[PDB]
Design a protein around this nucleic acid. Sequence first.
DNA 1: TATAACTTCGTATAATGTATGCTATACGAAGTTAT
DNA 2: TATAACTTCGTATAGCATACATTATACGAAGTTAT
DNA 3: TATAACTTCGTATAATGTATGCTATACGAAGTTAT
DNA 4: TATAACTTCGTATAGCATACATTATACGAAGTTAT
Lengths: 322, 322, 322, 322
Amino acid sequence: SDEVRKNLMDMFRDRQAFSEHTWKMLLSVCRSWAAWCKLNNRKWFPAEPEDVRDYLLYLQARGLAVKTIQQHLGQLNMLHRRSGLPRPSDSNAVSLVMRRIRKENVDAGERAKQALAFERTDFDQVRSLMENSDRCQDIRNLAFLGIAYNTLLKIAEIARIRVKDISRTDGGRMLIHIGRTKTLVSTAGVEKALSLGVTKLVERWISVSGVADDPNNYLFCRVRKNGVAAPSATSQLSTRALEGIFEATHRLIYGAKDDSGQRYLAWSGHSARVGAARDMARAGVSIPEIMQAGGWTNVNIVMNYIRNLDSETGAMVRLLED
Amino acid sequence: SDEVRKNLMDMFRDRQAFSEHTWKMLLSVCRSWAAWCKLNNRKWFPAEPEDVRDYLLYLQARGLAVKTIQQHLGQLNMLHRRSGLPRPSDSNAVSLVMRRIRKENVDAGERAKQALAFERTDFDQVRSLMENSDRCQDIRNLAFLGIAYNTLLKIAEIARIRVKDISRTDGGRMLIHIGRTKTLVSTAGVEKALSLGVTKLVERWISVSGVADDPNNYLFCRVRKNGVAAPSATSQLSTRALEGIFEATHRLIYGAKDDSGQRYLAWSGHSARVGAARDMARAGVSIPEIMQAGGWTNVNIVMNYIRNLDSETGAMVRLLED
Amino acid sequence: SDEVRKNLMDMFRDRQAFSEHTWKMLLSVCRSWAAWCKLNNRKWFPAEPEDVRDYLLYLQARGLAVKTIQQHLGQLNMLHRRSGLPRPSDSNAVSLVMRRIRKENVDAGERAKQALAFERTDFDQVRSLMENSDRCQDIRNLAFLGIAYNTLLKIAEIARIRVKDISRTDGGRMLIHIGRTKTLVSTAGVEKALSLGVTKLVERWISVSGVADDPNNYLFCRVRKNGVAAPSATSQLSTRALEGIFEATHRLIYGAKDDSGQRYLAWSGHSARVGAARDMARAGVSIPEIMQAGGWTNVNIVMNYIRNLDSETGAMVRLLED
Amino acid sequence: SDEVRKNLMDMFRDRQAFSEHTWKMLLSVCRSWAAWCKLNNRKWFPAEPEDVRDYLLYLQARGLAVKTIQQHLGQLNMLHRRSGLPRPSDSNAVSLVMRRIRKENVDAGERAKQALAFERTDFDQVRSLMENSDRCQDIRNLAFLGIAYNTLLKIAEIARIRVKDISRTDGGRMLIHIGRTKTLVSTAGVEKALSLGVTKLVERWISVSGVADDPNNYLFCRVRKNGVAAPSATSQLSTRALEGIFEATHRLIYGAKDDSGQRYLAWSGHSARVGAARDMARAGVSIPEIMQAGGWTNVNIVMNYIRNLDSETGAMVRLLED
DNA sequence: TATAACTTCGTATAATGTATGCTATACGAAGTTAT
DNA sequence: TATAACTTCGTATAGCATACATTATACGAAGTTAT
DNA sequence: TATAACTTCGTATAATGTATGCTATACGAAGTTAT
DNA sequence: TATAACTTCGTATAGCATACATTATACGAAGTTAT
């Protein structure tokens, strides 16, 4: 009763031990669960297993994805395990219904989607059009698109780059040192090399933006309606803005989005990462090489961007046709 | 007893958490365990470690495969873990016999088997033998044998193919929008293309059958002793019937089985999968293209199918032969 | 007191859960420890940690290897852990002295040795001399040496081979199916292919020995002074005899062993395995390929036969010399 | 208290279980922890989770590397585990801060460093500057710098080389029977060969020194302000003196340090190792030969040394550049 | 008959594996339906 | 507050190298059986 | 001034990492010894 | 004791596919600030 209160207090004291995103989703799931509980006159904490089971079934009935449901269940489990209490998933009712919901949704066809690919051809076509612009906005966007495709870095890692993180090979190729993440949080860190063509795009951006003024400045920054860049060493370009560059570039080439409300109708923050991964594979690049490129530690995730690369090769259709 | 009664009600309420094939196997182990118990005067629930030990030894004497004995122990362990009771595997005596049985059986020379291969040489032979046949069942069986070898699809997947899933891809070749994935993080569906040869086979079947008279009709259907097909959009051919086409075809060519009791004496549902993988290896197709073919995310099974091809003899044979 | 007696009784009942070699060493270490205990008026079971520490120090003082000492400690730990008691290694005194003994011995230069390599050149030289013999003994020995080098199989796996385990590629190369071991105890199993030259050596042995009479016969068998082979399906050629073939072949080429009493002055049961592993490496064979060849599951052991392959490459001595 | 007194006596009796460098580091953390405790009025033994938490936060504020803070917590954890007491890391509050500190520090941009490279361009420059020098210390330092770059050996290993360990391999080139392995399962020793150039350097040192007047004498020795060497078979040069040759040599060429406080501003003991690996990569030497060079069983460190070479730019740069 | 060629054995020392559980195919055989 | 040239020290931080529980090989010596 | 171009935010859904502990180098600085 | 051609069943055994605990992206909508 008080041991629980202490545990929770300890968790909140050292908040910084978890990503802000985890907290954000913890409160969002708690909001959702607490509302369902109120609407059903139930106690939201500690959670009763039969109540949690009803809630997950309610989420499925609302039409949410299987991964969304697993997230709600996962946030509830963390809140309890860290409170010193037993996890809802510790009961049959909850573990069995989750399995049953995954089964029925997947059987009805549900599948986890992945970002619309932005590949070598898309990059070449965008560079060919934007190459000739003098606008600060255009120069920045093209430089961002290039780094994204060349390095396979997530949008959050890109927004984190500082001018001082950039070095250069003896060959004149740019090098961006990256230190952590989801994960990777390490010592040492990594370096991402840019092709000569791409480092040229970045050079042009630094020049017109004037972010080199201070090595602490973040590489990318906002650019106001009048074309003036606003370098900063305290704030970074929101990842929401970066997803906006991918979306506006797609609209530039293909026009306005659908109306279906569906996701991935245009390029998004993860598009170049899935597009590059796939280009390397279709080129014969070895798995360890492809892995190094994306930072993937296992051969599973990799196979996953290629997870949607399965298409009739015609292999058997050739053996037979001869 | 109140709490295991609740757990058993949990299990039934969310029985959809597991597939019907899984349930049947569970019912099957309980019936056997229970029957052995009654016959030997022991309580079957909860199961005592010493009794489960005498039972496992019993299954060994019955000559069952270690794989099989592990399935009995496994289901027995589910029941108890789900129910709140202690698993027999958690016992030292049970843990010890399983290790003894496993080791003893491997020593006597136990090995896993796999489908007798149905290769191109066999497909050619069959085609030639029943290609001009006007018999509706022959027309249907040849079409089946073709798609099986060409697509490497499993029997349950071929049984689900409906008419509206067939389209045209090129040169009048056919396209089968199949679905070979049962996971959330995977590709929605694939498109299997049939050689020009195989396409003519399916065409002659759909014409002699009339399954196309309704898109909802299943590609394959029943053909009665009067050589008349019976299209249907609600009922598909049992995979048992599909395995029969394979054994019947082998009989046509080799006559009655070997009456040795053994398994894989004739062709079975996986024979075309085993054979197409080998032909693809003999013709030196890239492993990735061989995995896309069978839908393998890894190469642990495929390696078993092509293990004895001279192309897979290893580095040592390479070094020794110069 | 009785729970212990039961545990031990359970261990002995299901003896077959452990290799006969484990038992053999368990009794040998117990013999050693029990003798030291008697000579020092101490109780040998349960073992007192301070007593075990004295014993390990006594073994070090007797000049035994670090791996020998770790074995004695390991057998003592198993006897206790399986008796339901705490392991001697569970105490500081024992865990600290073991670490200290490893440290001091290794610091004084001790190193785990490995078998004298039997490589491609040795095999070619032995085949060149024995190729012309008509003696059953010679024909068998050469066939054994060939299979050992070609397959990298341990002597115990070789003595286990039965005539029925041998199949053949479509190319005329022999194939030996192997099922388990130290380890590997599996389902499925593996196939080892022989080069055309080596399968010829084996063919010649089967012919002159007459082991093909029964597919259950073990491939290798004894050969008496009069040249007559003694095929058997119940007994195998002792691994001690197989180590004898490697030793006699070395003496044939180099003459009588030293007098130092040292180990590995001549080829032994593991010689072809370490020799083949090393030949592949020096040939550019990839690790996964080399791994497949020896059955190694990890890249560590492999690096270990090559563990004694480190020699001045001259790499730096070339960069500088130009 | 009786049982932790016994454990502390266990630790001291078998202190040889750990190296002297390990002991010094342990004494160092205790002194700091104890000093912090007294200053803040807390008991230092056993350590309470909440106090260790305030201490770790203290070390973070002192600006120490996460690696360093983990060393304090680590030793603190040894002490307690060895002693029978409960480890502070086993506490939720301590577990939480370590995670917070680790994450917070990685976010501020913390990265590991490594020796400033001493490449061939640097060796050439130094040779040219002090090659005709008659000064005995210059003759000794050049010899050292040569062996370091040529052999990639660490300082403690070069400090141990005695005269009787040098032999001749070919064309009058030298051979150094070194020992770079501290494990039981490894190779006894290696033989490092020196280029013809480097060999002439060591020869001129042994002649101007007279260390060869007794095989037992260490290759390298003290050279007093009167330019007179002092051979000895019982005393070797401190690795600190060896690091001094590196910094002194860098001073000769670049002058006083950068007074920034930072690390690796001049050359250190590992500079030749970092530089020789890069030169070997620039000249495209096979990774295996680069590992044999530095004595690496893996390639996790070597990759850090050659991370920014254009030859190690990745597949993406390869694809993008065509 | 001595004796090659093992086998058995006991102490000494090097090498090696480290998971399961759910679901689909195998196949003889009983059950069903329209020729 | 001689000074070059080290050594010894204390504390930070980079570079490695794993443990546990079996199972299997190394080899001298003594026993075994068809010749 | 309206307005481009963000930022912040809250619900929805995809992606990812899964270790430590022992020992050696780094380097300013105090200690020692023979020029 | 019609029979071809299946279907349904029961039990053996081969073929796959993982969980947990975070952390990070997807995108519409509403608020914010230099122009």
